[PDB]
Design a protein around this ligand. Structure first.
Ligand code: 40S
Ligand code: 40S
Ligand code: 40S
Length: 180
């Protein structure tokens, strides 16, 4: 996409959970299930505002635990998240370090969703004892997402991807150039 960001409506991803998603990088939280997405897909960098992932809705499915490769299941439910947040490239190199020159993480995945625990998404998705998974995602209409957006936390906040057609398309827009 613009900026060299890798923004595909469907693909393979890794998955983790995180806490404290009430002041996320898009500048609006939401009451439904939410996630952070890796920087290369988010479409912005820390401090540069919302990227084009902001507000888009995705159906996530886990089907492997790379840390317990003999575990056969059960996995969790497929859930629909709204992306509200950035999983930065400069932080966790295991999961969100994808760049334009090296577009997969340490699990070989080109995308990562960090699912916010606070509002219930991770309890639907991760079986007890299996908090890091790999699997798939597909962008869906936000008609498939229960929830209400929070208020703007700063000027420029954006979740306008919530009404956009699936990628390829533009809503909030990408900021600067993707990490190399
Ligand atoms: C759980 C929500 C209550 C306000 O709608 C806040 C989540 O950001
Ligand atoms: C064959 C493995 C067990 C698979 O559940 C054990 C030996 O690596
Ligand atoms: C996390 C899930 C594992 C069972 O498939 C349960 C969600 O209800």
């Amino acid at each position: 996409a613009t900026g060299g960001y890798v923004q595909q409506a469907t693909g393979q991803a890794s998955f983790t959970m995180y806490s404290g998603c009430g002041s996320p990088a898009c500048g609006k939280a939401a009451s439904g299930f939410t996630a952070a997405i890796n920087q290369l897909a988010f479409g912005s960098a820390p401090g540069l505002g919302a990227g084009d992932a902001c507000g888009r809705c995705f159906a996530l499915t886990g089907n492997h635990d790379p840390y317990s490769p003999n575990y056969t299941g059960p996995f969790g439910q497929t859930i629909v998240v709204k992306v509200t947040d950035l999983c930065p490239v400069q932080g966790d190199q295991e999961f969100c370090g994808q760049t334009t020159s090296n577009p997969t993480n340490q699990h070989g995945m080109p995308f990562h969703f960090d699912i916010c625990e606070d509002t219930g998404g991770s309890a639907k998705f991760f079986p007890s004892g299996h908090g890091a998974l790999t699997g798939t995602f597909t962008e869906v209409s936000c008609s498939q997402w229960s929830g209400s957006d929070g208020g703007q936390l700063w000027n420029g906040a954006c979740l306008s991807g919530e009404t956009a057609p699936n990628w390829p398309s533009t809503a909030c827009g990408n900021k600067g150039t993707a990490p190399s």
